[PDB]
Amino acid sequence: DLKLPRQKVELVAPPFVHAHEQATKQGPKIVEFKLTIEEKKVVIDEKGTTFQAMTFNGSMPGPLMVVHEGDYVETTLVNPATNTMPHNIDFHSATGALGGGALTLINPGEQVVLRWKATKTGVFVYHCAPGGPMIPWHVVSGMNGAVMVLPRDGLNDGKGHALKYDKVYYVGEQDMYVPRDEKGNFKSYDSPGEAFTDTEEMMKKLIPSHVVFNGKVGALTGKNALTANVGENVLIVHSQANRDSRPHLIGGHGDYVWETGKFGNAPEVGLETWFIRGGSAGAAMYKFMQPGIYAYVTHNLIEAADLCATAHFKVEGKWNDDLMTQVKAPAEIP
Amino acid sequence: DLKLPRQKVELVAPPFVHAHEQATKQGPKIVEFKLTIEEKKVVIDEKGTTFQAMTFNGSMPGPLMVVHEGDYVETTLVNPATNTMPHNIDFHSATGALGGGALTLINPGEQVVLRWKATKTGVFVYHCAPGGPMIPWHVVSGMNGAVMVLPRDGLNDGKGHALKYDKVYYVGEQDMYVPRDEKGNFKSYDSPGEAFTDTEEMMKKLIPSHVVFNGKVGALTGKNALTANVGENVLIVHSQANRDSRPHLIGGHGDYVWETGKFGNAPEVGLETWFIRGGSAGAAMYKFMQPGIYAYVTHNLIEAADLCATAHFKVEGKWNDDLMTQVKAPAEIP
Amino acid sequence: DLKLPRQKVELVAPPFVHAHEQATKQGPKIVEFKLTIEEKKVVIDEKGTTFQAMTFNGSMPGPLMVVHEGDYVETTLVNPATNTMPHNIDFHSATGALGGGALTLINPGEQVVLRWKATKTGVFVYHCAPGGPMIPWHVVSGMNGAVMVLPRDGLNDGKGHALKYDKVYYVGEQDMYVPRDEKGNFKSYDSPGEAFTDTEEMMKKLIPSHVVFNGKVGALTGKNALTANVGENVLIVHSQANRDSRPHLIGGHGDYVWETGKFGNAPEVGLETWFIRGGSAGAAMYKFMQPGIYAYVTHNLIEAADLCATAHFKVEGKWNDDLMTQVKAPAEIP
Ligand SMILES: OC[C@H]1O[C@@](CO)(O[C@H]2O[C@H](CO)[C@@H](O)[C@H](O)[C@H]2O)[C@@H](O)[C@@H]1O
Ligand SMILES: OC[C@H]1O[C@@](CO)(O[C@H]2O[C@H](CO)[C@@H](O)[C@H](O)[C@H]2O)[C@@H](O)[C@@H]1O
Ligand SMILES: OC[C@H]1O[C@@](CO)(O[C@H]2O[C@H](CO)[C@@H](O)[C@H](O)[C@H]2O)[C@@H](O)[C@@H]1O
Ligand SMILES: O=N[O-]
Ligand SMILES: O=N[O-]
Ligand SMILES: O=N[O-]
Ligand SMILES: O=N[O-]
Ligand SMILES: O=N[O-]
Ligand SMILES: O=N[O-]
Ligand SMILES: O=N[O-]
Ligand SMILES: O=N[O-]
Ligand SMILES: O=N[O-]
Ligand SMILES: O=N[O-]
Ligand SMILES: O=N[O-]
Ligand SMILES: O=N[O-]
Ligand SMILES: O=N[O-]
Ligand SMILES: O=N[O-]
Ligand SMILES: O=N[O-]
Ligand SMILES: [Cu+2]
Ligand SMILES: [Cu+2]
Ligand SMILES: [Cu+2]
Ligand SMILES: [Cu+2]
Ligand SMILES: [Cu+2]
Ligand SMILES: [Cu+2]
User: Which atom of ligand 15 lies closest to the CA of B101?
Assistant: 1
- Are B246 and B299 within 8 A, CB to CB? yes
Which is nearest to C245 in space by CA: C169, C299, C178, C305?
C299
Helix segments in chain A, DSSP class H: 134-140, 192-203, 301-302
* C-alpha span between A87 and A95 (Å, rounded): 19
Contacts with B316 (C-beta within 8 Å, 6 or more apart), sequence order: B227, B228, B229, B230, B291
Beta strands in B108-232 (DSSP E): 110-117, 122-127, 144-150, 155-156, 162-163, 167-176, 210-213, 226-229
The answer to whether C238 is annotated as binding is no
Nearest residue CA, atom 1 of ligand 9? Answer: B181
For atom 6 of ligand 2, which residue has the closest CA?
B158
Compare CB distances from C203 to A292, A306, A331 and report the shortest one's residue: A306
- Cis peptide preceding A136, ω within 30 of 0: no
Q: From residue A38, give the alpha-carbon distance in Å to each of A78, A82, A86, A203, C119.
A: 9, 8, 11, 22, 47
Same fold, C6-153 and C167-316: yes
Tell me the CA–centroid distance for residue A108 and ligand 13, in Å: 12
> How big is chain A by its Cα radius of gyration, in Å?
21
Q: Say whether C87 is catalytic.
A: yes
Report the candidate in C79, C73, C72, C63 with the shortest Cα–Cα distance to residue C112: C79
For C331, the closest of B81, B110, B115 (CB atoms) is B110
Residue of B180, B258, B273, B328 to mutate, interface with A, max A Cβ within 10 Å: B273
In one-letter notation, the amino acid at residue B329 is: A
Is A114 in CB contact (< 8 Å) with chain B?
yes
What residue owns the CA closest to ligand 18's atom 1? C331
Residues of B in contact with C301 (CB under 8 A): 129, 135-136, 139-140, 241-242, 279
**Ligand 6 centroid, distance to A294 Cα (angstroms):** 6
Residues of A in contact with B324 (CB under 8 A): 94-97, 100, 103, 114-117
Q: Is B103 helix (H, G, I), strand (E, B) or coil?
A: helix
Taking the CA of residue C298 and the nearest CA in chain B, the distance in Å comes to 9
Please check whether residue A207 touches C, CB under 8 A.
yes
Give the CATH fold of the A167-179+208-316 domain: Immunoglobulin-like (2.60.40)
CB-CB neighbors (< 8 A) of C275 in chain B = 275, 277
Distances (CA, A) of A167 to A16, A123, A220, A235: 9, 16, 16, 6
B324 touches chain A (CB under 8 A): yes
Pairs of residues, one from chain B and one from chain C, whose beta carbons lie less than 8 Å apart? 168
B96 → closest Cβ in C268, C292, C304:
C292
CATH topology of domain C167-316: Immunoglobulin-like (2.60.40)
155-194 in chain C: CB under 8 A from chain A: none
- Report the SS3 class of residue C33: strand
Candidates A308, A175, A191; CA nearest to A241 is A175
Nearest to A144 by CA among A125, A121, A116: A125
Q: B137-140: long-range contacts (C-beta < 8 A, 24 or more apart)?
A: B137/B196, B137/B199, B137/B200, B137/B203, B138/B54, B138/B85, B138/B87, B139/B241, B139/B242, B139/C301, B140/B174, B140/B175, B140/B176, B140/B177, B140/B203, B140/B242, B140/C301, B140/C302
Q: Which listed ligand is nearest to A131 at the C-alpha?
A: 11
Atom 3 of ligand 15, nearest CA residue: C250
Experimental technique used to determine this entry: X-ray
**Measured from the CB, is residue C182 less than 6 Å from ligand 18?**
no
Which of C68, C248, C253, C312 is an active site residue?
C248
Determine, for residues B95 and C289 on separate chains, whether the beta-carbon distance falls below 8 Å. yes
DSSP codes joined into one string, A47-93:
T--EEEEEEETTBSSPPEEEEETT-EEEEEEEE-TT--S-B--EETT
Q: Where are the domains of chain C?
A: 6-153, 167-316
Residue A6 half-sphere exposure toward CB, CA atoms < 13 A: 8
User: Is residue C273 annotated as a catalytic residue, yes or no?
Assistant: yes
Please identify among residues 281-300 of chain B the ones whose CB lies closer than 8 Å to any CB of chain A.
289-290, 292-295, 299-300
Specify the length of chain C in residues. 334
Q: What is the CB < 6 Å shell around ligand 12?
A: B 316-317
The full length of chain A comes to: 334
CB burial class (10 A; 0-12, 13-18, 19+) of residue C230? middle
Instruction: Answer whether A284 contacts ligand 6 (Cβ < 6 A).
Output: no
Binding residues of A: 87, 90, 92, 127-128, 138, 143, 156, 158, 264, 299
CA of C305 to the centre of ligand 9 (A): 26
Ligand 12 atom with minimal separation from the B230 CA: 1
Burial tier of B103 (Cβ tally within 10 Å: 0-12, 13-18, 19+):
buried
Q: Whose CA is nearest to atom 1 of ligand 12?
A: B317
CATH architecture of the domain C6-153 equals Sandwich (2.60)
* Resolution in units of Å: 1.2
Cβ pair A83, A115 in contact under 8 A: no
CA A94 to chain centroid, in Å, comes to 18
A20 given a catalytic annotation: no
- Ligand 14 in contact with C182 (CB < 6 A)? yes
Whether C237 and C146 have beta carbons less than 8 Å apart is answered as: yes
Task: Give the span between the Cα atoms of A188 and A165, in whole angstroms.
Answer: 42
Cβ contacts of B7-12, under 8 Å, gap ≥ 24: B7/B31, B7/B32, B8/B32, B9/B33, B9/B65, B9/B66, B11/B35, B11/B57, B11/B63, B11/B65, B12/B63
Residue among B271, B292, B323 whose CB faces A260 most closely:
B271
What's C218-286 look like in SS3? CCCCHHHCEEEECCCEEEEEEEECCCCECEEEECCCEEEEECCCCCCCCCEEEECECCECCCEEEEEEE
User: Alpha-carbon distance C301 to A99, whole Å?
Assistant: 35
Q: Which of the residues C74, C76, C78, C92 would you substitute to probe the A interface, choosing the one with the greatest number of A C-beta atoms within 10 Å? A: C92
Q: How many CA atoms lie within 13 A of A315 on its CB side?
A: 30
Q: How far is it, in rounded angstroms, from Cα C64 to Cα C146?
A: 5
Contact (CB, 8 A) for A51 and A176 = yes
Helix (H, G, I), strand (E, B) or coil at B111: strand
Beta-bridge mates of residue B75:
B33, B114
With residue B302 as reference, give the H or E element that holds it. Answer: helix B301-302
Listed in sequence order, the residues at least 6 apart from B45 whose beta carbon sits closer than 8 Å to its beta carbon are B210, B216, B217, B308
C15 contacts C61 by C-beta, under 8 angstroms: no
* Given the residues C138, C210, C253, C312, the one annotated as active site: C138
Q: Rounded to the nearest 5°, which phi and psi values hold at C70?
A: 90, -10
Q: Rounded to whole angstroms, how far apart are CA atoms C198 and C207?
A: 14
Is A245 in a helix, a strand, or coil? strand
Q: Is A81 exposed, middle or buried (0-12, 13-18, 19+ CB in 10 A)?
A: exposed
Say which of C292, C294, C305 has its CB closest to residue B133: C305
Task: State the pairing for strand pair A324-332/A268-271.
Answer: unpaired
What 3-state DSSP class applies to A223?
helix
Substitution target from B221, B243, B325 for chain A, most A beta carbons within 10 A: B325
Residues making up chain B, counted from first to last: 334
Q: Contact, B315 vs B229, CB < 8 A?
A: yes
**CATH code reported for the domain at B6-152:** 2.60.40.420
Nearest ligand, CA of residue C158?
A: 3
Local structure of residue C134 (DSSP, 8 states): H
